[PDB]
Design an enzyme around this catalytic site. Structure first.
Site, PDB file in Angstrom:
ATOM      1  CB  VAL A 163      -1.125   0.159   1.188  1.00 51.52           C
ATOM      2  CG1 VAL A 163      -1.962  -0.951   1.044  1.00 51.52           C
ATOM      3  CG2 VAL A 163      -0.378   0.104   2.426  1.00 51.52           C
ATOM      4  CB  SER A 173      -6.066   4.173  15.292  1.00 48.43           C
ATOM      5  OG  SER A 173      -5.668   3.963  16.825  1.00 48.43           O
ATOM      6  CE1 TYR A 176      -1.089   3.871  13.727  1.00 52.38           C
ATOM      7  CE2 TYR A 176      -2.269   4.499  16.141  1.00 52.38           C
ATOM      8  CZ  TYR A 176      -2.203   3.526  14.608  1.00 52.38           C
ATOM      9  OH  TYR A 176      -3.072   2.651  14.734  1.00 52.38           O
ATOM     10  CB  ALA A 177      -1.547  11.024  17.024  1.00 56.09           C
ATOM     11  CB  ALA A 178      -0.141  13.388  12.396  1.00 54.10           C
ATOM     12  CB  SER A 179      -0.459   8.927  10.022  1.00 51.07           C
ATOM     13  OG  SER A 179      -0.868   7.760  10.874  1.00 51.07           O
ATOM     14  CB  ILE A 219      -7.205  -4.530  18.727  1.00 57.18           C
ATOM     15  CG1 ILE A 219      -8.398  -3.364  18.293  1.00 57.18           C
ATOM     16  CG2 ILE A 219      -8.024  -5.880  18.036  1.00 57.18           C
ATOM     17  CD1 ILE A 219      -9.654  -3.491  19.196  1.00 57.18           C
TER      18      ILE A 219
END
Lengths: 245, 239, 245, 242
Positions: free
Chosen positions: D58, D136, D148-151, D181
């Site tokens: 991806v 997320s 990760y938060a921004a993406s 999870i």
């Protein structure tokens, strides 16, 4: 079947969304108790699907109480509840009579508190369960609906709090936020106004009660076992961006 | 001065936050009307600042009405209003008596409605203006506060709707969502622990947020929720 | 003076909003450093206000690094930073070339990370401070702006994380989300566009750069000392009605 | 069966949530195309369920493109897509190297843009459909996860934009926001974290991939036909109060 033998109570079950929900849940094998204000149409709707009719006025603390006692006596337990019973009294705030403001808050906000509190007492410490409270896309604000928007915004807040308090007891609480759904109550909406609501809807059409019912099914079934304290919009994207006009 | 000659009415002006706001606004040159339920402390807080005291029970429609008449008779116009008046009756829902649930809604939600409606009446099509309603970080839900959270969440909904109906008239409606403000023991540590800025907030700081929202410096800002909670709400889904 | 002697750096200071912010911050007594991409207009804008000009390409890691070293050498400390540098490349997603997607993300999102990171490095463990990142009302989603919306929504997420990490160091991080502001990249926008936006704006008008500047002043000054991790919309209520994010 | 004869493609289908979704969607009668980076575990996961395996990166534009061409050659149509494929590179921002920042955005944010763009192209003006992109709960901000938060926050903004653009074509775009999870990735997570995560979860436990799969099933099926541009949290209430 997703609700096989699940004991579920539904308010406003006689008309529109409540009715379509009662039908969908019945096909999903739920043992139901249909609640609404008018006995005549309540019994008809309930009988057509095999549910047990219990007249309830969600605005009357005593009525809600008696109703749940009957429902429990008939069901023996409670696995979930979908609350619909709601009304509107539109008017720009400067022309809105206090009586109109207090009536919708009493019926929509306190009514949801009374039903939810009853649902909670019937389940907490007894078994896990799922409570679904219905608000509306309008809780985010909408012209001529200060009372409706405030009462439904209150329900979202109630939901998040209830979700926090009942979580450890295996009881989930979520709220539906439908948009413009075509029912008997929207038949009166003027054509130039309908064209306007649909235009603000990415999906370009009005919603169907069955579609709200499916949202309810999901939230109440074990398939949403890890979802609580959420607001699920069923408005075709009407709220993604703000609506002008 | 940022409120030079502006006519402003303030509710809950006798208590901490309201009091701190009266003082700030006075220094900013506002012509003030101080409102609250108890005359004794109201008169004193108003006199120390040079404001005009007007007794008001925001839960009473007629009191709100008479109140604004006095304010308008004294000020001649209304440029802004900061409504604080609020209460709590905590309890887990299963132990929360209906009376308690209806009282906080009546005072917090319906009270905010009566005040905002009167404020609007005094300004709509007369002059532009700014209305600030006080909600709370708890409108996002909080243990033992179903009634408080629901009522404040209602205030946010009310403010948004009001902002839409009043926007064309130059009247702005915004809502303050304060967090943990100073004037309690182990309840403090948990609160401060959940606070990125690591401390309790002071009334002055909430007053400054009110100053901003009511002054012409926020002239293009309306329908907003401004959290003054030290970041206690970061990470929680917004509503 | 709410910025009396405070050391402040502004990016995109040569453009509309940044320029108005330089002017306001100068009146408020700040010792300024103006950053932007084109030297000519930067020097002009900085001099008109008495700010120190530092050419910067927020999209270049090394350019941002060099810029901040100059800033620090000239200021000696950093009390606050207001970041405005941004770009757009509109197109419905199906007609959007990867290149246009990657560019706005690199400039807008990564550019904010670079500047916020530099700002933080200059203050963390040295002194408290305030960092203001500029997103946009469009972060909530907007027609033909998948890239802009995605990048600006990322900035909001970045802000929120940064506020959590810097909180204990007395450093606040907040985001501005301006709406339709009358500058120059809008001066001659096709009339039907200008009309569209105003009709969707409750205050019924375009915003002015100065108005966004005051919101920046508020967030950066000691007056918002207990406010962090927030998204302040400066769009005349154009976002009211859209589900929050 | 909820997805009878529906042609669906799933990314990150080899492990955890993707694999669980693949299995559930197969029981629901979908004609599937499983996509993931590693051919070995991909073919295994697909064969065990009767899905058609197609290796896809991806993060690679050309890889995503070839993948959808194969998928379409095999399916002939696309009714929906569930995109999972994501990665993390935790670190407080002061210790986060640029490369780690750019990698998570490229893979998580641009990766979603590429997959959603290919999914849209295969359906727009051809037939109504549903696109589910996975964000997320961290999109709201989280310690040590600026990148990760921004993406993920960018994915929420992408989803909303796409929903607005594709609504008229009967194509829905919604995003899942799972919480903690239980996976073969969270298992190694130190107890310090576990206790902290579970403690902040009203439901008092970790989530299971099947539960996220059910959320995907709902958003992709015709049951959510009047729902678009939404963020559905599957985090046990972790995001109610932070």
């Amino acid at each position: 079947m997703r609700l096989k033998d699940k004991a579920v109570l539904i308010t406003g079950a006689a008309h529109g969304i409540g009715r379509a929900t009662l039908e969908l849940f019945a096909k999903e094998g739920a043992r139901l108790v249909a609640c609404d204000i008018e006995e005549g149409p309540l019994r008809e709707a309930a009988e057509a699907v095999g549910a047990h009719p219990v007249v309830m006025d969600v605005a009357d603390p005593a009525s809600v109480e008696r109703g749940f006692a009957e429902a429990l006596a008939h069901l023996g337990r409670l696995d979930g509840v979908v609350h619909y019973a709601g009304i509107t009294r539109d008017n720009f705030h400067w022309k809105m009579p206090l009586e109109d403001w207090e009536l919708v808050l009493r019926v929509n906000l306190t009514g949801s508190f009374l039903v939810a509190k009853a649902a909670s007492e019937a389940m907490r410490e007894k078994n896990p369960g799922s409570i679904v409270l219905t608000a509306s896309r309008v809780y985010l604000g909408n012209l001529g609906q200060a009372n409706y928007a405030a009462s439904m915004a209150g329900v979202v807040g109630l939901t998040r709090t209830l979700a926090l308090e009942l979580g450890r007891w295996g009881i989930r609480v979520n709220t539906l936020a439908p948009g413009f759904i075509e029912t008997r109550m929207t038949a009166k909406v003027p054509e130039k106004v309908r064209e306007k609501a649909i235009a603000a809807t990415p999906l370009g059409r009005a919603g169907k009660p069955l579609e709200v019912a499916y949202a309810a099914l999901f939230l109440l079934s074990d398939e949403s076992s890890f979802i609580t304290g959420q607001v699920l919009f069923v408005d075709g994207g009407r709220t993604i961006g703000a609506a002008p006009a």
